[PDB]
Structure formats: structure tokens, C-alpha cells
Design a protein around this nucleic acid. Sequence first.
DNA 1: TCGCCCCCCTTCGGTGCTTTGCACCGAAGGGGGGC
Lengths: 406, 553
Amino acid sequence: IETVPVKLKPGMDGPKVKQWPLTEEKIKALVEICTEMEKEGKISKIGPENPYNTPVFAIKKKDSTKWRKLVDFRELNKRTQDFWEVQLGIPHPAGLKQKKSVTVLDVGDAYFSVPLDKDFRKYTAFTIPSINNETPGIRYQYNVLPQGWKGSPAIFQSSMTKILEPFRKQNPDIVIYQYMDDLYVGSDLEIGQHRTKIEELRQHLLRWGGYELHPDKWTVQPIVLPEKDSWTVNDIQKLVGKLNWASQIYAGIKVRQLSKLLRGTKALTEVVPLTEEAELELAENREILKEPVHGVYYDPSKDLIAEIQKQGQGQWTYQIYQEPFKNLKTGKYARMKGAHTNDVKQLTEAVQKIATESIVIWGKTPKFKLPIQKETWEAWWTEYWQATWIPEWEFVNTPPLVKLWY
Amino acid sequence: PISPIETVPVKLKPGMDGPKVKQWPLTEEKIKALVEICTEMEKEGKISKIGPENPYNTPVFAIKKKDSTKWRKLVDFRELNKRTQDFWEVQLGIPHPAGLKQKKSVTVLDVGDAFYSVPLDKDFRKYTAFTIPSINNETPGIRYQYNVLPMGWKGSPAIFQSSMTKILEPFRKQNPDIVIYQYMDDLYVGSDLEIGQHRTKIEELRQHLLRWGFTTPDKKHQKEPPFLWMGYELHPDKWTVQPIVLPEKDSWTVNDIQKLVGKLNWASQIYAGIKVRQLSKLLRGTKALTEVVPLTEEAELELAENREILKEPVHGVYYDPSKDLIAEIQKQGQGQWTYQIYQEPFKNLKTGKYARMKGAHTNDVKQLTEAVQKIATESIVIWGKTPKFKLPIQKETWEAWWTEYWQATWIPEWEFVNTPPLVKLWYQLEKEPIIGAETFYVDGAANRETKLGKAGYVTDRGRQKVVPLTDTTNQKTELQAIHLALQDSGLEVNIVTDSQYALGIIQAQPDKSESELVSQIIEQLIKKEKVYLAWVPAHKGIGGNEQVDKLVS
DNA sequence: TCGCCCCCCTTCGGTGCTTTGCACCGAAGGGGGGC
Ligand SMILES: Nc1nc2c(ncn2[C@H]2C[C@H](O)[C@@H](COP(=O)(O)OP(=O)(O)OP(=O)(O)O)O2)c(=O)[nH]1
Ligand SMILES: [Mg+2]
């Protein structure tokens, strides 16, 4: 078959990102994997005259106890031409988030049957490191549509459509959405009856070449206000600063008849009785925060952004937005691994879950603002990553003035 | 011999052409060293004569080798390198003897004339034009181009390393139980075979290299311990660094101190407890490498301590894969940390230190976390796994940190070790207001263009204060306001500010800072008994805050 | 009068914030070590 011409965006050059250190078992997995891929012609060994590189590592899902090679092509994808400009990419079905159970399938291997534009292959180079630098790094580049490259689902688009047509025609009310290397497959079948149709789809695939989500239960988490019977000055200074911040999100929120309560230089633990106009002002503000914001709409042309705050007790709140203070979704992620005691694992899992929700809902992942030191994140996050995609992220140090989302 | 291996195609950067730079003058001892290398190099096909058709040139020179009597031909390809394509370097790091395993039989080999045994892409050779001057006046020099990798070209190391890897690949796959550490042209070859069978494999390896144009001269073939390798000495059971000679000086220049600090960092990989904070401080604010810098008393003490350590002989041991790795950290003061990595007690694999100051404001717990992260990364590099940690921080202290701190943080499997001084939080902020304690409504403001500012407070018990401030900033005044409330308050205090900034710093529980002013506040926070700190939005007429915001107006 | 690699310590300068300095961070200066 004939390769599709592919270019970087104008004025950009290929990725030049250093390989980071890898554990013994990840290096072993990759040597085994890349060796086998080399024999099958999917990659070729290259030298240092190719000046591009992309980090490579390996993940292993507990419920699939084999390793999965993961090339972090985030940089290459940012620099790759758009196929929306060139009319090859994928659309998002609005019905997927309506389904009762969504299963995630890794169909990365379907790409390895299509060759890649030979002028573009050099941009896919990666380097396998060596324990104690016993040897120089070993470099490969791709000869076929790589896993994790955004041009792969676009180029393989028409192929994937034809593979799936019989299944989608036989199961009209199952919704399949391709996101990168994954198929997101939702239906309203009883759980065991869902899993059987997934096995059927897996079979239709193997005649050419995870665990269950529940958008049903992705509740939104609002801004709540404390309920008590007695109120101190500090309770009301914290209530006011909170509502003042919230007046950047909601409309017509009032602080005048609660600030009045505090007039005077008062003791923080001084119990101040609510007036009836403060009770009116409070129960009123309470309801505005109850039901959601009027006038917030998804814009597919703009990026998604996700913020996360650590709240303790293994709890994690998050907001997804494209414009400041116009949240498309507020939520709260809670862990259950067992110990209670790994923040970086919890945050890494919170990030995969939030990004998974954006794919189901809007069809793409958000750029994350992560509440963690860059170097702490980079020391550990690959130990807990379980997805075939990686979202964009940046690192923020944001002291809470208000515990706004709790 | 010239390897028959394929040449690596290499380009100039687009739009760029080749270097046109004149040879400078050289001594007659160096001209004769080059002529002999060069006439010989032409006879081995390493270089070829060129003529005026080739417009390029680049300067050449020569240094001596540690092979005391031989010379090293170098070309100043700075100009060619700029215009040469980029490469992806395949040397990702430096092997460490602590990552070696005990081997029954060991050999160290070095390839002769390594770079000159690898051919250079034929289309690129014309850009390597140079000239040998021969005492300058009497003749225009004799001109050559390289046919093989030049020493001084940006691409030569990686192309050689890549070529060596390919040449070694067949032998490695045929002998998976023979460890070959391949660093540039230096081969460490370890095996668990008997010496006789081992030396058979060596011959085989050496014959394999010779077929591909890589000689292994006897002079660089080490057969017996101690093996000289990568600046270390490998014995069967242990390893040492080659001797470290510290500068001795009555008068110290900036450059001398830079050299001294670098030596000590190199030593810190096996000498425990090395410190360079006070010596490095001396380089701050200096303006020339030759500026005399007087050693402070603290730098003299630190130097003295380091000399006592360097006087005691040390050795590392080798890695036993069947045992756990253990990393133990001690606190040394002033943001300095030292660590040891062992498997059996008092048999260190290696040591090291962490002393970087990250951020303007931090605390010991954060810096301990950074040390942990440095050690973890280093351990992946050397042994492919992270170690078990023994840390001088109570489990209670850590739990108190990662619950009240708003960022995700973590340490892997670790064990408390009572080695004072211990890492600890130097104060904590009450998460609830404190009954009976005074309430301070603090505020500070500065005129953005004027340099002038005011810091002050008002109090529930009725107290009142304003402080003129000169040459300040908006953020400083807020810090000063906090500075005052802590200063004029009892051991228990409640405080209220409207600087998200100040709240951010203090709430992170810093115990040190590049800011003298923040240090003072830290000082004062440590002396207090309880402190509740609270924030309110500015300029919305809140009780107390409005009283003080008015007052500071 | 050179090249490539890792490390540490200092200095400088670009970025973005509902800023007017400030904190963060990558790069480049110096040094150590390797071939
Ligand atoms: N540009 C440059 N390359 C060096 C330098 N030192 C070593 N190399 C490179 C080039 C050498 O060919 C290669 C191996 O180092 P060696 O010390 O063994 O020199 P070489 O093998 O060429 O000669 P030899 O027969 O071993 O004495 O590493 C240097 O100072 N400058
Ligand atoms: Mg040599």
C-alpha cells in the first residue's frame, strides 16, 4: 500500500527530547519488544546522524500482566501537521457518555500493518538506555504507523471504519469511539452482557489483527457552604472570602449583608449571631451554588484545561474548563487502592481518570495543571501510568486561600 | 587498519558551507610530531593530500598524551562544528564501578588509534581540509583532508560509539555471559569463566575487533588487578578512586576555589561527609577567575574537615544483585546532605551528597525529599532499581507534612534511623483559631512608583501600630506586617492578612530562605507556641481587615 | 586554541501572573571526572 505524505507544521523541527533513566525490568521489556519489532520490520536500527529523539518507557497493567511499550510522542504530535486541515481525523459521538458501561480496548497493533511516509520516519526515533551505561543507547525509528502518534488514527481511519462496519451495523446501540490507540466502547447492557459483546468485538478484530467505566456515576461536585448551628467571626471571614471568589464563577452573589456582620475589629473565636438578612443572603447564595451555571458551553476549537487540588483523606477535587471560571465540569476523585498512603500514585490515577472522562465526554484530553513539584512527579509517575496515551501537563504551586471545592 | 564498516552519512546544516580558517603558528617540536603522524597517516590512508580546488581549511594543533611520549593530533573544528548537522548523542551517561558485579576473570582493553580506524563519509571529507605549517615562513603548508574520524569534530564521538556498538554486537549475542562495558574505545570485559577459557574469549574478541580494523595494543591490555578503569582502580573484592590531590595554596584565586570544589565533588562519590557549601560561597559575587578571594574562617574549617576525610583510605564494593540496596541519608546543616549506599553494613557501594538550594523558600523536609529523589534517580541509572531508604525523620513528622501540605509528595519504602540532627518541621500552623489568643488584622502596602510603604495591624484587644518603610515592594510590606504581629504578640496569636503571596510562603512551613526578611519571620514563627493564620480578600470592607487597611492608608 | 558524555555551584534571563516584583526554570558560565 502507498504511504500518505506527512509533514511537520511549518517552521517546526522534529522532537529532540532526552531519554530518561529506566528500571532494569522496563529496559528488558523494551529490548525484548524492540528486538521482535525489528525482526518484523516495524522498526529499524538507526545511528546518531538522526538528530531526533523521543523518550520511551514501558507500562504493565495489573489485569494484563504483559508489558506495553509506550513512546511519549507528545512533542512529535504537537509538531505534526493537523489532519483536520487535511481532512483525515476522527469525529466524537455525543452518545458515548450516555452509556451505562464503557470498556477501553487497546488496538495499537492495528497500525503496524500500514507503512509510514519514509521522509517522516526519522522524526520517530527513540533510544533504549543501558543499565549503568554499560553501552551507548540503542536507537530505532519506525517504519510503520507508530503507537501514540496522532497521525496513526488519522491515516488508519478508513481502515478502522471498514473493520468495524459489520459490528456497528449488527449492534446499532453500541457506540465505538476511537481515541488514539484506544477504542471506547459503550452500551446499556447488563454488565455481564456488556462483557460478552466486548469479547465478540475482540474476536472480530483478531480476524484482521481494560476494566469498565460508568459515566452513569460521574457525579458533579458543587461548591457547598458549611452548615452549623453556631458561627464565629472566622467562620464568616472564611464564608465571605469563599463567596467572593465564587462571584467570579456564578452571577449575582452577595457579600454586603454578611461582611456587615463582621464590622469592627473582632476576636476570631467570637460567636456572632446570624441576622435574618444574613440568613436570607446565605440560604440564597446556597441555592445559586446548588444548580449549575447558565451560559457555559463546550467549544471544540479550544483546548481543555484541568485543575486538581489535594484535599486529604485520599480525596482530590478537580475542574475542567477552557475559559477561566467557566467550568464545564467540577468533580471529586477518591481512591481505594488500600493503603491510603501514596499521593503521587493517587494523583497519577486521578489524572488518568479525569483524562479518561474528557475523552468519553468531549473526545480529547485536557492539559493538566498538576499540584506537585515537577521533580517529584518525574521521579515516580511512570510507575503508575496505565494508559496508552499521555496528556499534556504543567506544574503549579498553588496554596489554598479558600478550601473552595470542599 | 581502517574499519571496512559502512560510513555514516553526515550533512552540513542547510544554507551553510564549509570552514575557511587559517592555520596559526606552531613550535617545531609540534610540527615534527604532526609531520610524522601525518606522513604516516597518509601511508595508512587516514588522510589524503588536497589542492586549491578545495577552498576549505581549519587550524590544527597537538597536545601530549598520558602515554607520556606520544602526541595527540587535534583540529580546531569550532567553525565546522557550528555548520555541521546536529547529532543525537548515544552516550547517555558514565558507568560507575559500584554498578559492576563481582567477576571471576576481568580484562581491560583499549583500541589503538580508535577514531582513525573509522572511515568518514566520503562526501563530507572535503570540509575537513587542514594544513600542517612547518615553521611557517619558508613554505605554504602541506594540505590534507581526513578520510577517517577527526579528533575535534562534533560528530566523531557518536559515530565512533555507534560503530563500536555495531562491531561488538555479534560478539555480545554469541557470549551473553560476558559483560563488556564499552566506554568510547575502552572495553572492560568481565566473565565468570576460568582464566584459561576467559583468555580464549579475549583473543576471540580481539581477533573480531581486528577484522573490523580495531587494534588492541598489548600496552593497553590489562590482565591483572588492579585494573585502571574510568579513573578508578578495580580490585577483585573492592574498588577505589585514583588518588585525589587537592590544591594547596597560601593565596587562593576564584579559579583555584572552583578547581578545589570540583575535586571534592568528585571525591564525594566514595568519601562520606564531604561538604562544599562554605568553599562555594566564596565564589558568590566574584568578578574574575584571577580575583584573589580570601578564605573565610568557615571555609577553612570546612576545608580542614574535608582533608581529614580524604586522608583516611576508602574503598567501595561491588553490586550483589541478590541483596537489597539500602540508601542512608544524614543531615549536615545549611541545606547540606550526605548519603551512603550499601547492601551489607559498613561496606559502601558508593557515597554522595545533595546540597542544591531549590527555590527561594524551602524547608528540611522538602530538601530531604529532593535528596531522596536524587538518590532514586542515581540508583535507577547505576543498578536499575531504587533502594530501601533509612532516613533521619520520624514517621510522625512525615505524616504531619504530607497531610497539611497542599502538594502531592511521597517517599518510597523507608525506615527511621536515629542519627541526629533529625529532620523535622520547625513549627506548625493551627488549622483552627485559638481561644484566648489575640487577633491581629495585618496589612501592608507600598507605593509602586515611590518605593515607600506602610506595615501595621489592629487588634481585637485594641492594639494599634503603623511602621514607615522605605525602598520596599508591595509583597515586602505584607511580609513586614506579618513580621510585626509575630513580634508584638505573645506565644499564642491569631493573624489575618490579605496577601495570598505571604500566606503561600508561610503556609509552606519554610525553615530557610534566601530572603533575610523571610528568615526573620521563620525565626519568629519557631519561637511561638501556637499560630493560626488566616486570609481575607482585600478592599471589600471586612471587619478588622478594613480597620487596618484604613490605618495603613 | 579540539570533540562528545555525566556530575555540582553560580549566574542570567525568559515566562506568566487576574503581577508592577516574584518565583520558577532552562541554559550557560565555571569546575571535577571519563576517552
Ligand atoms: N577531540 C578529542 N578526542 C579524544 C580526546 N581524548 C580521547 N579522545 C577520543 C578520541 C580517541 O581516538 C578516543 C580514544 O581515546 P585514546 O586515549 O585511547 O586515544 P587513541 O585511541 O586515538 O590512541 P591510543 O592508541 O589508544 O593511544 O577517544 C581529546 O582529548 N580530544
Ligand atoms: Mg585508544
